[PDB]
Amino acid sequence: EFAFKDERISFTILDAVISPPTVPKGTICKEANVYPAECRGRRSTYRGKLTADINWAVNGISK
Amino acid sequence: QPMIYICGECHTENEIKSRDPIRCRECGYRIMYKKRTKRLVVFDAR
Numbered sequence: 381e382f383a384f385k386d387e388r389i390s391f392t393i394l395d396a397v398i399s400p401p402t403v404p405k406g407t408i409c410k411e412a413n414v415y416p417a418e419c420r421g422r423r424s425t426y427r428g429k430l431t432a433d434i435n436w437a438v439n440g441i442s443k
Numbered sequence: 444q445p446m447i448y449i450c451g452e453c454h455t456e457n458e459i460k461s462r463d464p465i466r467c468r469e470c471g472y473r474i475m476y477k478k479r480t481k482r483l484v485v486f487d488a489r
């Protein structure tokens with residue numbers, strides 16, 4: 381909870397999940413998953429998307 | 444002929460010219476090996 385011009389913006393993260401590693405969206409591909417043996421040979425990171433549900437609310441009402 | 448390349452997972456002989464996106468033209472897997480052709484290399488048996 382912090383202060384705007386005499387309102388009170390309130391955030392909270394309700395839930396956060398990590399997806400298993402896929403290709404980026406828009407990629408024309410057949411097997412959408414990414415396996416570790418690709419990421420060793422191409423020298424990239426084996427990484428999964430993190431995303432959460434933030435709950436913005438001004439002056440106490442969940443909006 | 445153009446230089447044959449081989450995909451890592453579905454094994455299709457893709458002929459990558461120098462001006463295209465590199466990808467396999469069946470599945471789309473990005474790591475692509477290179478095909479060994481006929482040429483003479485001399486190794487000693489020692």
Ligand SMILES: [Zn+2]
Nearest residue numbers: 450453467470
């Ligand atoms: Zn392929």
